[PDB]
A paper describes a structure:
Asp42 donates two hydrogen bonds with the guanine group of G11, forming a bidentate interaction. The side chain of Lys113 donates two hydrogen bonds to the phosphate group of U2, and the side chain of Arg146 forms two hydrogen bonds with the phosphate group of G4. By aligning and comparing the structures of UP1–[name] and UP1–telomeric ssDNA, we found that most of the interactions between the UP1 residues and nucleic acids are shared, except that Arg82 from RRM1 and Lys113 from RRM2 only interact with RNA fragment, while Gln12 from RRM1 and Glu147 from RRM2 only have contacts with DNA. As expected, when we mutated both RRMs of UP1 (D42R/R146A), the mutant could not bind to RNA at all.
Heterogeneous nuclear ribonucleoproteins (hnRNPs) are RNA-binding proteins associated with complex and diverse biological processes. [name] can recognize both [name] and telomeric DNA. [name] comprises an N-terminal UP1 domain (residues 14–184, tandemly linked RRM1 and RRM2) and a C-terminal intrinsic disorder domain that contains an RGG box and a nuclear localization sequence (residues 196–372). Telomeric repeat-containing RNA ([name]) is a noncoding RNA transcribed from telomeric DNA regions.
Author numbering:
A (entry chain A), B (entry chain A): 6 to 186
The structure:
RNA sequence: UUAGGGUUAGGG
RNA sequence: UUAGGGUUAGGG
């Protein structure tokens, strides 16, 4: 009886201690809901832990409640849980990078800070809003950077590439530095 | 009449818009106290802005109140203020890197999380505390990583290299990744 | 079309 | 002496 989809309910649990089994991974994350699925990824030959796994709750509400419980110490080790990234986007560069900033392209020269603030507040607490303009000329360049205080907010946004802000169909990507491009 | 030293009262203001003068830099940061010193660094020949400057309050209280006002938009641009780093440490690698994690070496096999928590809480809100141990052997390795929610907390700590925690003289350095060493 | 200015570490 | 395990992205 699961209404919400699987990917929205799934969490990638990276950095798992090599002592973590399916059972010890389940016995930890079950404190924040019921687990539809809980697996520790292993090598097909050695069956040794590959250092990451997946958990899937019945509700996305439980997924958010799980993320509200960071940090997570499973089997005596701090793990890094991340919202599940599609097998599509996982091939794209920087999809797995933990960032607190996003790229917003297509705002089209009439979008100000309050437009971004009023829209993106619904995903998390906003730190900075930078409307990119051409220096000296003052012309707006049609894209902006929004920085949140929590990386999980960014991860919830970029799974939906397209957003309609201020009457524009915009693209939202994870903010990559110049040295990662 | 300045009791506290100069370096503790000085802030490095990086990323300054090239339109920022001493006066516009002062007219912004004077909202959080009195400015002992306020300079925009320029090239000796062109006198064009080098993109950074310094401000110095009369109290470190005003310096903390200034940092509580992040982000700072000076002359229509978000600037990155940092606690002043000695001309010594500025030669050391990674001193200017904005990090939220610290290295703590010398805790010596009898220091647990609560020892680090009770000591380092006095500098800011703590996110994670990782006591580094040898896998499989369980032996403690004598160093730890402490992650704060604010980079400014880390910057206030690492200006004092040596700290006495749990009866040990420990070294505190900025957490550098493996790829920056 | 929609990728940032890391000259963003010292003048006195 | 006091530098981290980025095999931390898919099994079904």
């Amino acid at each position: 009886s699961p209404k919400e989809p699987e990917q929205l309910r799934k969490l990638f649990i990276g950095g798992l201690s090599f002592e973590t089994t399916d059972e010890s991974l389940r016995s930890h994350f079950e404190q924040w809901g019921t687990l539809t699925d809980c697996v520790v990824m292993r090598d097909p030959n050695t069956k040794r832990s590959r250092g990451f796994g997946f958990v899937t709750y019945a509700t996305v509400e439980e997924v958010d409640a799980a993320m509200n419980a960071r940090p997570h110490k499973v089997d005596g080790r701090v793990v890094e849980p991340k919202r599940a990234v599609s097998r599509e986007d996982s091939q794209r560069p920087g999809a797995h990078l933990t960032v607190k900033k996003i790229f917003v392209g297509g705002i089209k020269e009439d979008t100000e800070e309050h437009h971004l603030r009023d829209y993106f507040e619904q995903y998390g607490k906003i730190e900075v809003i930078e409307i990119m303009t051409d220096r000296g000329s003052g012309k707006k360049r049609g894209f902006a950077f929004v920085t949140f205080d929590d990386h999980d907010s960014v991860d919830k946004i970029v799974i939906q590439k397209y957003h309609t802000v201020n009457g524009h169909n915009c693209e939202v990507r994870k903010a990559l530095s110049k040295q990662e491009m």
